[PDB]
Write a protein that binds this ligand. Structure first.
Ligand SMILES: *[C@@](C)(CO)[C@](*)(O)[C@H](Cc1ccccc1)NC(=O)[C@H](Cc1ccc(OC)cc1)NC(=O)[C@H](C)NC(=O)CN1CCOCC1
Ligand SMILES: *[C@@](C)(CO)[C@](*)(O)[C@H](Cc1ccccc1)NC(=O)[C@H](Cc1ccc(OC)cc1)NC(=O)[C@H](C)NC(=O)CN1CCOCC1
Ligand SMILES: *[C@@](C)(CO)[C@](*)(O)[C@H](Cc1ccccc1)NC(=O)[C@H](Cc1ccc(OC)cc1)NC(=O)[C@H](C)NC(=O)CN1CCOCC1
Ligand SMILES: *[C@@](C)(CO)[C@](*)(O)[C@H](Cc1ccccc1)NC(=O)[C@H](Cc1ccc(OC)cc1)NC(=O)[C@H](C)NC(=O)CN1CCOCC1
Ligand SMILES: [Mg+2]
Ligand SMILES: [Mg+2]
Ligand SMILES: [Mg+2]
Ligand SMILES: [Mg+2]
Lengths: 195, 233, 212, 222, 204, 196, 222, 196, 195
């Protein structure tokens, strides 16, 4: 886990998530997808305690898919983010809380607008232009404060993302084995294959 | 680092128009056991200073030896030992304050709270506190332990600020002190009925009263109290 | 603290913030975190305030004695190693210091040494040190080139401290700028973040996260 | 286990004018929830037109003041009765405090006086010796209550010129001794209302080229 | 691990002449890392204003919870809840979680629509009501706020003067706290108009 | 506390000091540690004031209910009810209780219930912090079938010594006499008992 | 806190200071620590402020329902029994320390309750951080057969001892008199001996001093 | 331990039990806790056996050296030497010592030195774990200027009670009589003292 | 610090040492030389506690250089290793021990033989054909058990080393920023520039 980023641009939301899965002194995998599609226009990346992350993501996924079938309708990114926050807010006062931080990137088809929500394991939600969980933020937030503009294209967002990944590979102590990038826009969710 | 074993409770004191009064009970407690009952915790130095000591008694006895030795040393090669170059309360205090702070600074305190009461050569009243931490302060009323919580409030109704001191007589002042000692006997579980009291006056000198007792105690109302709420028998 | 110093075409840039903290209490906003050891030697301060202050002023006294005894200005390597050997004697005692010794000599050229209280001593072209070091690194590394003009390098250093002053809760106050050349150090003024942030936001078009 | 430290409460305040400086402090001394003394002075004239206060743990404070007073005395003996400048006093105090870096004096220290150009000066220290000259500093228990008020009223922080679209700041200017003493008294009455360790009395020491003057004011005794 | 100072924030409220003011900062951080500069801490239910400092997840939760309750209140009572009544509702709801509490410092502000009286109140995390004529403070820079308010405040201020006072109190307190600042909002509340102003403050 | 109960010819007498402490501060110097659980069954309380109070209130409830159904309970029955509470809740209680009562068949009986929740029937019993100091005295001076006046002196002298040495004990000495005659409350002030 | 209770000829009086604290800070300068359980049973509270408020309202509520059920005026022993059983159940985790006083068909009563659920009886009582200052006054001046006016004087004197000598107590004195046959009179701010002195200066700013970014009208209507 | 020393008309008597414990095991049931530091200055030892033993050996050395230079030391001098050791090494010692001796000028004197290292001159003194149980008894039964036989009974009865209640005390009662006549050792076996 | 390896082949000793210097979440440097030349035919790599490593290396270096000047003679790798072990063996019972592990690679000119000594901070010495300190060993020892032969050339030793570095970059959790390689043979000490 560890590295998950998100950048909201003019017409899309870009999520970048590290590929490494480590335990002890062994990198067990270098091609891990730390994300689940909650609905055709909504994507959630996740990071945190082992086991909890996937269990939580898939539990949320099932719930949103159940809603979609029942109402024959896709829930708005705002509504999904609020649902997810409430689940984490419950969890933190449970016997054993989900120790999972997430980013929810979605395109709202009613507003024709991209939206990025940052939610930590306590159930703390914020809508942001750019977001990060873990130590990543300590480098990326300041970088994006400088280089980010609100009217950027998806292509300009990807260049801005490369700039983040470059800085992280330079200064982060751990080898996170690069990232998988996914774009969320009016035409749905697609993955960039060469990064 | 110590822990106090045999201890003495409150020492109380106040200024009045011509001098100072200081008092302290004659008990040496051993935890909850009221082990020793003939302990003098007011120690006069010359005829112009009384040092009242609370806390660890073994350390008190040590301080007694220091003060006794101080008098001896001051007399050496001093023709004016009983005159211009006699020990002042301010000299005795600063010496103790010095010692206390050095001992705390070497993480080996004298586990005590001390009040030096006396009258300077120029007639001015001296009253100052020092404790195991080397903390010092002065006030028209000073008290240690429970004394600080229960005596001071009562003594401050008499002398609330500096300007009340000339207005306060020795009869009024002693009455307040003796009343305070009664209140402490009611409410302090490590106090005794027997106590000593000392007046240092700028005209009449040092009067040291031993074997005093708390008297005129209200207990009669006790016979009316039954149970803890609903009891009638 | 955030402090940085980097090497480039035209010498060395040194930029530091000016906040002092006592936990979450802001102790001061107007603190000097750079010491001018001599006309050719600078020292930056991060960590415990007096630890840095006391021992870097002491370092200045040791450097002064060296030039009296040797009739020659101390090397950056030797000055940095006096400080690193000193803190190493106190290793374990609980000193907290993150320092950079920057300066020029003919035999060395422009030189930067990172010295910390664990006893680490490193020569290098770029360092950022303190609670806001990561924020400064993010901006500096993504805009740094060797071929920067003195004007651009001065600004990049200023902008990197500003970035950290903004995000890091334990950095802020104002930016103090320095430039070090073959001819010695040159002070490039105090820049209060209170005005600088809005000036930079407007002119650069950056900081779009904030309500303008 | 023996705890060699204690908290005697109180609060102190230093403001510097053009040709003067004030060092104020309340006269209350406490431990826990008890009042030890309603008048125990903690701001002292140390000679050479330097006034000093060391607030926090009184035993450490008195020890420090005592040592600095002694430092001034020996400075005179060793350097032909030369006047100890305020900047030199500050540096001397840094070494006193840092000498006990690994067993500190639990005190926030402030000194006030005049610099070598005759202008008002306030220097302030942390417990282990780091110092800084400022126009303005509060120290001790109520420092957190008073300091932001001083930022606002002495250095005119967050105050802009009316009708300038928040573009032109309120200009800095020196304050008169009359204005400074108003701020001191209002600072302490405010602090007294909202902090339990502050009260009883206020004592101010004013420093001009003519010497050191005192002023005293009653404070609420609850 | 002290919930009250992970995210940071401050709220302050004052009374004036036939008016009240309530202000908050905009910072949401994760200790040293500032994360959001848009995070508002004041909400309203009809004409009653509630500001909440402390752990942000609880701030959000409690807002959602009081919206819930005041909506049901209004449906059944057929009228908007008043500040004195809402204050009691907050107290009840907080004390209901006595041994598993929300880590918050709420502040109620509003004008009673019947009597026209300005009303402010504050609580601890567990429900104890702190009613006051003059002012209420809350958050990581509460010491600072207490100091600013106690010196700057005076009774019977006009809305336009009260604005300057509450704003200056908030601003200068936030500048002496590491976890507060990054923007500020001030609500000036009169009997039947409410002005909301965003303040320019230093962004460090 | 210093507390005791002593059997004699005509019945039984319960005695107690009147000091309640919170640390070294005396919260109450005229406390009534002798509490009625039935007409002629009383108890002395040592340990936690809250625990002994809540226990005594429950016992009083049980014996009032016992009385309504089965008539007057024996002193042994009262002690069994105290035990059942003290024993079953031994981890959560700090209560050292002495039970004393007068039947007409069994005369005066004394049962002591220390911290463990065990029961011990005895001729006399002592308990509380101050009781340590009077084990030697009470063992040497107790006789069976004492008169009322002899028993009053025994308790008065005993508690006087306990009070004299134990700082956690003091104030007045309260006593309660349980005989065929009825119930008599007694009180003895410091000025009297101190100089015995 | 400082709270007291004093019995007299035909009833009972309770009094309290008006300071609330958060650490060394005074949160409230004039809070009411005198609570109504029923019209003629009043309660003084110390310890955790919310616990004293919550436990007093809960029992007051149940006492009202009980009084309605039984067609009788409520008794002090009922409030005592209910409070003590409630507090005991929570093993001290509800930090309420109360002085309960009142008049009922049985007479006039005065009790104290500690957080763990132990109760006491007295002619005079005091609780809170300033209880020792107050108790010293009560032990010095209390006597049998006090008049109403003598009891009020004694109670407020005991509270004053707390105000002045205890840092956990201050501001004003509230009193409640409960006399047999009569209505209880709640004397809010019976004494106000800690009035803030006139400030030296007004800090009303020039309008436009504060820099503004945005304005907007907020919609509170439907 | 249970130990005591009592002054009387002709001098002073020291008394002690004979039980040494390591936990609940009795390491030695015939211990001699009464130790000679000079011809007619003896002490009773309570607390750590090792500490009190090493102290007593040092004191004996000091008084032997005192004697060689300045003649026979006073009982007060002996107590001062005990104090100096106990006070200065208070952090490293667990020693509660009673000192008793016979001068011809001062007659019988008793000094007690508890854990703190303080000194207390008294008519009689009690110490050790078992002394708690006989404070009440000893206070009630001690008179000044008793005869030798009266004083022997006082100690015998007192220690009998201490032994009876304290598990850390038992075995035989040893006594040492210090008078102008000389030094007399006494011993009293369980069969005698138990049934007093 | 962290990664230091050593391989002794037919005619040389190859030392490989990681370039990263990290503190907290920041890689402060990516070009650090974790080695000191003790004498013309003796090289020591080091790894361990910050500050201690260099202080120890330079202290040992000065001592060996002093010996060389005094006797006008180079000490044998065996003798240097024994000196270094004794210093560490002293250190471990000091008030504050040197927490430094080392590898000493040298060419003995009298025997015409390469020698590799592995010494940990406790003063535990072993002569080995291949050695490693830290977590490195958990991967490299088994790899070398399989691929290493005693009669290999310096070039074959470097290929064997690349095989170690490749495995470490694949499976180690931390980014150690590659290695600096140095060869110790009859002609002295030289550094490989492209690795
Ligand atoms: C930023 C602001 C993070 O703190 C910087 O590191 C800054 C650097 C600096 C340099 C020169 C002058 C002032 C400030 N550091 C601080 O402001 C520093 C933070 C800090 C405190 C304590 C530490 O303990 C190891 C480490 C760092 N703040 C202080 O030194 C403040 C003014 N003083 C104290 O906290 C007093 N302490 C010091 C340690 O001993 C106990 C008393
Ligand atoms: C003497 C003091 C020693 O045994 C008595 O047992 C006495 C008995 C008594 C007092 C009043 C009414 C009836 C009976 N006990 C006390 O006065 C008692 C001291 C005590 C407290 C706690 C104990 O263990 C839990 C044991 C003895 N005092 C109290 O209970 C007072 C009212 N409350 C406190 O001191 C508060 N305690 C609550 C429990 O936690 C510690 C603080
Ligand atoms: C005096 C002021 C004590 O100093 C009184 O006892 C007072 C009683 C009182 C009663 C009703 C209304 C106002 C005041 N007590 C307090 O004001 C009380 C002091 C206190 C705080 C915390 C405690 O437990 C650690 C114990 C006593 N203050 C409060 O209750 C304040 C309003 N609340 C908090 O500080 C929040 N705390 C409550 C306890 O749980 C942790 C958070
Ligand atoms: C009674 C038991 C209680 O005071 C006496 O003081 C008695 C005195 C005595 C015994 C023999 C000779 C002369 C005097 N003390 C003991 O018998 C003593 C019990 C005791 C041990 C340690 C103490 O504190 C450190 C206090 C009392 N028994 C011993 O010293 C025996 C010989 N040794 C041990 O039990 C071993 N101890 C050594 C210290 O660490 C604990 C284990
Ligand atoms: Mg900042
Ligand atoms: Mg005050
Ligand atoms: Mg801020
Ligand atoms: Mg007693």
């Amino acid at each position: 886990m560890d590295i998950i980023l998100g950048i909201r641009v003019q017409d899309s939301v870009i999520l970048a998530s590290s590929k490494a899965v480590t335990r002890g002194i062994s990198v067990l995998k270098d091609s891990d997808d730390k994300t689940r599609q909650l609905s055709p226009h909504t994507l959630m990346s996740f990071a945190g305690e082992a086991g909890d992350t996937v269990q939580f993501a898939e539990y949320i996924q099932a719930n949103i898919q159940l809603y979609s079938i029942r109402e024959d309708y896709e829930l708005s990114p705002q509504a999904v983010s609020s649902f997810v926050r409430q689940e984490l807010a419950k969890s933190i006062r449970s016997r054993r809380p989900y120790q999972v931080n997430v980013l929810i990137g979605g395109y709202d088809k009613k507003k024709n607008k991209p939206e990025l929500y940052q939610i930590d394991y306590l159930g703390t939600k914020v809508e942001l232009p750019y977001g990060a969980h873990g130590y990543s933020g300590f480098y990326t937030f300041s970088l994006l404060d400088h280089h980010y503009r609100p009217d950027m294209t998806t292509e300009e967002g990807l260049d801005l993302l490369k700039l983040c990944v470059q800085e992280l590979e330079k200064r982060m102590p751990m080898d996170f084995k690069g990232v998988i990038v996914k774009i969320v826009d009016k035409d749905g969710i697609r993955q960039v294959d060469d990064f | 680092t110590q822990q106090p074993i045999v201890t003495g409770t409150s020492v109380i004191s106040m200024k009045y128009d011509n001098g100072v009064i200081i008092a302290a009970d004659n008990l040496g407690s051993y935890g909850s056991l009221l082990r020793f009952n003939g302990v003098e915790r007011l120690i006069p130095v010359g005829d112009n200073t009384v040092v009242g000591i609370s806390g660890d008694i073994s350390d008190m006895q040590h301080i007694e030896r220091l003060l006794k030795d101080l008098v001896t040393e001051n007399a050496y090669d001093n023709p004016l030992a009983d005159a211009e170059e006699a020990l002042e309360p301010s000299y005795i205090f600063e010496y103790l304050a010095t010692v206390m702070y050095q001992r705390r600074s070497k993480m080996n305190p004298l586990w005590n709270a001390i009040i030096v009461a006396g009258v300077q050569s120029n007639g001015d009243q001296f009253l100052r506190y020092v404790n195991l931490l080397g903390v010092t302060y002065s006030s028209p009323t000073l008290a240690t332990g429970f004394g600080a919580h229960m005596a001071n409030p009562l003594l401050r109704k008499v002398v609330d600020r500096e300007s009340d001191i000339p207005k306060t007589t020795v009869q009024v002042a002693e009455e307040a002190i003796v009343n305070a000692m009664r209140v402490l006997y009611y409410r302090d579980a490590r106090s005794s009925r027997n106590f000593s009291l000392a007046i240092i006056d700028k005209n009449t000198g040092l009067t040291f009263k031993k074997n005093l007792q708390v008297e005129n105690m209200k207990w009669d109302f006790a016979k009316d109290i039954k149970g803890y709420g609903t009891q009638k028998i | 603290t955030t402090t940085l110093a980097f090497r480039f075409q035209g010498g060395i840039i040194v930029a530091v913030d000016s906040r002092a903290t006592a936990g979450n209490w802001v102790a001061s906003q107007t603190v000097k975190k750079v010491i001018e050891i001599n006309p050719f030697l600078l020292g930056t301060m991060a960590g415990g305030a007096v630890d840095c202050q006391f021992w870097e002023t002491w370092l200045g006294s040791q450097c002064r004695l060296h030039e009296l005894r040797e009739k020659e200005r101390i090397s950056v390597a030797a000055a940095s190693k006096i400080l690193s050997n000193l803190v190493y004697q106190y290793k374990g005692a609980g000193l907290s210091m993150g320092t950079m010794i920057c300066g020029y000599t003919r035999k060395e050229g422009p030189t930067i040494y990172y010295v910390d209280s664990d006893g680490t001593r490193l020569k290098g072209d770029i360092f950022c040190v303190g609670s806001g070091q990561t924020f400064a690194y993010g901006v500096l590394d993504s805009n740094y080139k060797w071929d920067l003009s003195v004007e651009d390098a001065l600004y990049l250093g200023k902008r990197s401290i500003l970035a950290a002053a903004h995000r890091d809760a334990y950095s802020g106050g104002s930016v103090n700028l320095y430039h070090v050349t073959e001819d010695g150090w040159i002070y490039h003024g105090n820049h209060d973040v209170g005005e600088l942030f809005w000036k930079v936001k407007e002119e650069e078009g950056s900081f779009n996260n904030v309500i303008g | 286990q023996f705890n060699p430290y204690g908290d005697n409460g109180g609060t102190i305040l230093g403001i510097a004018g053009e040709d003067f400086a004030v060092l104020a402090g309340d006269t209350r001394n406490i431990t826990d929830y008890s009042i030890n003394s309603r008048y125990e002075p903690k701001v002292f004239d140390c000679g050479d037109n330097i006034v000093m206060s060391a607030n926090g743990f009184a035993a450490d404070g008195d020890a420090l003041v005592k040592r600095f007073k002694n430092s001034v005395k020996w400075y005179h003996f060793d350097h032909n009765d030369k006047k100890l400048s305020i900047n030199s006093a500050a540096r001397n105090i840094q070494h006193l405090l840092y000498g006990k870096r690994f067993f500190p004096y639990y005190v926030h220290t402030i000194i006030a006086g005049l610099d070598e150009d005759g202008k008002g000066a306030v220097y302030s220290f942390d417990p282990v010796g780091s110092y800084e000259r400022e126009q303005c500093r509060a120290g001790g228990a109520a420092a957190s209550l008073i300091m932001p008020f001083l930022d606002n009223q002495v250095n005119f922080k967050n105050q802009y010129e009316p009708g300038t679209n928040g573009k032109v700041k309120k200009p800095l200017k020196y304050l008169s001794v009359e204005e400074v003493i108003k701020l001191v008294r209002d600072s302490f009455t405010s602090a007294t209302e909202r902090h339990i360790q502050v009260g009883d009395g206020l004592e101010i020491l004013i420093v001009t080229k003519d010497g050191v003057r005192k002023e005293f004011y009653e404070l609420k005794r609850d | 691990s002290d919930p009250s100072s992970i995210n940071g924030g401050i709220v302050v409220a004052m009374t004036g002449k036939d008016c009240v003011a309530i202000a908050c900062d905009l910072r949401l951080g994760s200790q040293s890392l500032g994360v959001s500069n848009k995070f508002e801490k004041i909400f309203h239910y009809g004409h009653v204003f509630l500001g909440i400092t402390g752990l942000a997840t609880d701030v959000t939760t409690l807002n959602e919870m009081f919206r819930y309750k005041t909506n049901l209140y209004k449906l059944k009572e057929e009228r908007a809840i008043e500040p004195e009544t809402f204050t009691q509702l907050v107290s009840s709801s907080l004390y209901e979680r006595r041994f598993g509490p929300y880590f918050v410092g709420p502040v109620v502000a509003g004008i009673n629509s019947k009597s026209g009286k300005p009303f402010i109140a504050g609580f601890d995390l567990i429900g104890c009501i702190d009613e006051a004529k003059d002012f209420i403070v809350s958050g990581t820079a509460s010491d600072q706020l207490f100091g600013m308010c106690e010196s700057l405040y005076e009774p019977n201020l006009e809305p336009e003067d009260l604005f300057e006072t509450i704003s200056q109190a908030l601003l200068n307190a936030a500048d002496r706290d590491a976890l507060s600042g990054w923007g500020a909002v001030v609500y000036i509340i009169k009997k039947d108009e409410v002005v909301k102003r965003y303040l320019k403050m230093r962004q460090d | 506390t210093s507390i005791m109960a002593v059997t004699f010819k005509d019945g039984v007498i319960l005695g107690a000091d009147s000091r309640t402490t919170t640390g070294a501060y005396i919260a109450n110097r005229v406390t009534d540690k002798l509490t009625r659980v039935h007409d002629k069954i009383w108890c002395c309380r040592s340990g936690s004031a809250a625990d002994t109070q809540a226990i005594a209130d429950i016992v009083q409830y049980h014996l009032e209910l016992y009385t309504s159904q089965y008539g007057t309970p024996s002193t042994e029955t009262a002690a069994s009810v105290f035990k059942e509470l003290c024993y079953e809740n031994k981890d959560n209680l700090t209560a050292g209780i002495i039970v004393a009562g007068y039947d007409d068949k069994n005369k005066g009986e004394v049962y002591t219930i220390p911290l463990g929740g065990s029961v011990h029937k005895l001729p006399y019993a002592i308990a509380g912090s101050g009781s340590t100091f009077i084990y030697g005295y009470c063992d040497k001076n107790f006789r069976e079938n004492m008169s009322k006046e002899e028993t009053v002196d025994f308790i008065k002298h005993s508690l006087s010594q306990a009070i004299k040495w134990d700082g956690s004990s003091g104030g007045v000495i309260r006593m309660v006499v349980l005989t065929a005659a009825g119930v008599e409350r007694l009180i003895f002030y410091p000025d009297e008992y101190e100089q015995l | 806190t400082t709270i007291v209770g004093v019995k007299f000829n035909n009833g009972v009086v309770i009094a309290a200071d008006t300071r609330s604290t958060q650490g060394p800070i005074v949160a409230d300068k004039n809070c009411a620590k005198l609570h109504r359980i029923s019209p003629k049973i009043w309660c003084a509270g110390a310890g955790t402020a919310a616990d004293t408020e919550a436990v007093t309202q809960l029992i007051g509520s149940n006492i009202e329902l009980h009084s309605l059920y039984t067609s009788r005026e409520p008794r002090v022993v009922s409030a005592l029994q209910m409070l003590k059983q409630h507090l005991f159940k929570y093993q001290g985790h509800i930090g309420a320390y109360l002085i309960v006083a009142g008049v009922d068909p049985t007479g006039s009563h005065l009790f104290s309750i500690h957080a763990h659920g132990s109760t006491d009886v007295g002619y005079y009582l005091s609780l809170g951080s300033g209880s020792l200052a107050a108790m010293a006054v009560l032990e010095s001046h209390w006597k049998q057969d006090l008049t109403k006016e003598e009891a009020i004087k004694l109670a407020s004197d005991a509270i004053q001892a707390g105000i002045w000598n205890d840092l956990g107590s201050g501001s004003n004195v509230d009193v409640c008199v409960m006399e047999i046959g009569k209505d209880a009179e709640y004397l809010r701010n019976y004494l106000t001996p800690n009035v803030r002195e006139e400030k030296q200066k007004s800090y009303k700013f020039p309008r436009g001093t504060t820099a503004v970014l945005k304005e907007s009208i907020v919609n509170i209507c439907d």
